[model samples]
Target: ATFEIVNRCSYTVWAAASKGDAALDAGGRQLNSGESWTINVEPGTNGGKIWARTDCYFDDSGSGICKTGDCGGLLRCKRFGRPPTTLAEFSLNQYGKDYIDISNIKGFNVPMNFSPTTRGCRGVRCAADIVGQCPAKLKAPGGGCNDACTVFQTSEYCCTTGKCGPTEYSRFFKRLCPDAFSYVLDKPTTVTCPGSSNYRVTFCPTA
Candidate 1:
């Protein structure tokens, strides 16, 4: 299956993806407001994720930093980027279906949508102006909104003991993006589609 990562944020963004230890699209790439990048995902690929980094600066050697979603300051990430960013996750060809979700578990930076190109498959999105409306305590220094778990690190929000429930912070995210995974233990919003379907991840997506 193929995954198209598009940027429509009216600003430049660095798109990145990873599955297991392997980085997709050479780990990351620059995309202008109207540009896009595509990757051909192999069948049976699991634990795959796609996200965007904002306000990034990379030298010719693919080394730099981003205000948000920095993966160890590397342009081509070998591992998952930091939290406080939106995520599009996938597990392809698992038992004849592709499991997919839009996650804000770590927090949110960009508005995004994860959708299949195949007909009849519904898409999931988190397009609210979260940053502008973010609660003061959960706001990050530079940009983006931080998840309650990242901020408090307690059982109340972290679910460290596996017996936790939603807090006001999680509910805030859920209210804006009902289709997204707002908290770690929140009822999953995962959806399934045919393995043959190609998917798209769009940053700054419209309604």
Candidate 2:
């Protein structure tokens, strides 16, 4: 999805000489504030783009690209803007609160999409025979009892050791399984981040 940047400025807008040359594609030229042109953007090989900086640049951080203006690899779009805008309109910085990606384009400088990701791990399933330490906050009820004590019941285990009282386990869970939750639950309900949507299968261990 590409549109030419017409000289919408009241003055002559200086356009950079060629493609992939933002330094040469200056918006300094005058467009009589209402002039317009057309720019074609067929899906090529630039791995699509996202969050264009009103300056016609794209953000490529997810792909391990540098910011601040090092156009070596992304010579097509030139700048892997840290937080680029979209090609919907033309401007140096004016933008809304959202970002854009070129995922669907499948080529250089195309359109993309982004989705939410799971924040942390969910708790593990509790079986009566599985005794373990839980976090200090929720370990009070399920601590000290053998795994058989609450075989098929729902209770709070330690966030770390699967046992109760050992706060250190919480830290370990965070470091080791950063992605999974140290807790478990079957029904879907708001635990931490209420009113959110993401994909996760966490089964935390509480001792």
Candidate 3:
């Protein structure tokens, strides 16, 4: 399957992805506003996550940092991003059904939309202005909203030890973006996109 990562924001954005490093067409490229990057996804690829890095400045050696979604200061993130990032996770051939979701469990830096190119496949997105309405307690230092788990590390919020469900904080985000993964147990977030077609991920997509 092929994936298109589109930057529709008003400023430049650096997109990042994880999985087979080869699956990323331009893993750390600076996508100016309105630009799009496309990558071919390998079959059976699992644990693929894509996110955008904002307010970045990398040196010639790609060693500078980004204000948001910085993966250990690495320009090309072969590793997962740090917290306070909007994540688009996908499993190309999990068992049989392909799965995809926009997860804010880590938090949200930018709003995003994920949709399949083929008909009948449902699109999932989180296009709310969470950053603007972010609760002061769950706000990130740089920008964006922080997940409840990030603010309170208790097992209740983190779901680290036992079964858990959405709390007041998680519900806040869920209410705004009903289709997003606001917490770890947000099982309803995952949707179908059948792994053999083209898909698109648009940043800052709005109605």
Candidate 4:
């Protein structure tokens, strides 16, 4: 909330109303997370209602294009390499997995220049079964595909592979969501998170 003081002068002439029913203001304002400001405009003696409306367009009722970035919620997040706490894959060797080696895959759908032994600070880990560690390994068996969806190419970071980019918020909607066969699927994972197998993710928009 804010404060404003106005002093109207006494005049013989009559005041006029502004034009357009919806023309309350010449423009709108979209602020950063946790911000507030008041706009002051002088109305003649014929003052009308000063309607203050919170952004209703953000309600995404199949109308506007207000995405996660340009408009909407504010969230903060961080990304770091971690152990694969739960088994994210449906493979037999995934049992009792612990961490995904970031550096040593033979080849992936995307050919990354980096090594697979990069390391892990976050990801699904295995707790029981064989393999001792159902690490979060990328599907890099060489001759990778061209799909950006799987980090098959390093030019663009595929939402898949679970290699999240650092941001205030991270979002991977159904379109960007991994397949049912993936470790990041919505269905219950085979290894299961300590609490839930699905890694919790958030997102801000590209806009």
Candidate 5:
């Protein structure tokens, strides 16, 4: 299925995507307010993710640091974005279904809406203003909220141990965004859609 990355926020957003846990898209582009861009991905693009960079200042050479979601200061991200940012993850065409989820498990920066545009598929969102009420311990320096794993770096928060489950910190995130993955073992937050469905990922859809 194809994907559309939409920027509904008033500011320009630099969109980044990983080709199923591989390198970043070399042709990644920026979207102005109210603008949208379509992505053509191959089948079995499982374990891929997309996110938007904010407060970015880059020159023609493509070097800068985004206030949030910066990927090693590269315009064409060589890796995943930093923590304290929202992520739209998809495991396409697995078991004859496409698994998708909006995750705040690494913490949240922007409000996001993942919905199907062409086919009638389930839509999931995590559009709450998490920064306004972010816990002091998990607040990032520039802005945005840090995940419990990032703040604590312990097995309990990071789920590095053999057995893991939700904690009070993860529950804090789930309370606001019940539809988004709040922790490593957040199975219920995932939404499985039919294969070959066209989906749209919107940034700042509520703001």
Candidate 6:
């Protein structure tokens, strides 16, 4: 499946993807406004994720820190990025179908749209201005909103006991992005598409 990653934000975004040690597009790329990067995903790829890093400054060697979603300060990330980053996750050709979803479980930095390019299939989006509406305690430094588990770390937020439900913080995120995963134990928001379908992941998507 081909994943077309587009940056519609007014500013620059460094896109990153992680799937085991596989270096998808050399692990990342710097996308200016209106720019895009496409990656062909292998069949049966599981737990693959794509996200954007904001307010970054990387030298020629591709090393620097980002204000949000920084992964070990490397432009070519080798691991999952830190929290406060919206996630576009997918598993390709899994049992004759593709599973996809936009996740705020790590928290949201920019608006997002995760959709299949094929016809008749539904898409999911999270385009609310969550950063500006974030609660004080769930707001991350520099920018973006943090999940309750990341900010509070209590069982109520973390669901360590597997008996937790939505809280004020999770509800806050859910209200803004109803189709996104709001917390660890949040109800499944996963969408399924035909195995042959390609996809698009857009940042700062309008409507």
Best by TM-score: 1
TM-score of each: 0.96, 0.20, 0.93, 0.16, 0.93, 0.95
lDDT winner between candidates 3 and 6: 6
Off by over 4 Å in 5: 24-27
- C-alpha displacement of 169 in model 1, angstroms? 0.7
* Residue 83 displacement in candidate 2 (angstroms): 15
Q: In model 1, which runs have C-alpha deviations exceeding 4 angstroms?
A: none
Error of 1 at 187 (Å): 1.5
Ranking by TM-score: 1, 6, 3, 5, 2, 4
* Candidates' C-alpha lDDT: 0.89, 0.24, 0.83, 0.20, 0.83, 0.89
For residues 1-207, could you state the per-residue lDDT of candidate 2 as single tens digits?
233344422333222112333422221221233454333333221222222212223245422222212234242344333211111111111131121111100001111112223343232222122113333332223122112112223223321334433123323333333332223321222123111223211111122
lDDT of 6 at 161: 96
Worst ten-residue run, lDDT, model 2? 103-112
- Which regions in candidate 6 have their CA more than 4 angstroms from the true location? none
Candidate 2 Cα errors over 4 Å, as ranges: 16-32, 44-207
lDDT of 6 by residue, 13-89 (tens): 99998874665657788999999899887788888889999999999899999988888889988788888899998
lDDT (10s digit) by residue, model 4, range 30-119: 333323323322322111211111222433332232211111121110111111111111111124332111111111111011111113
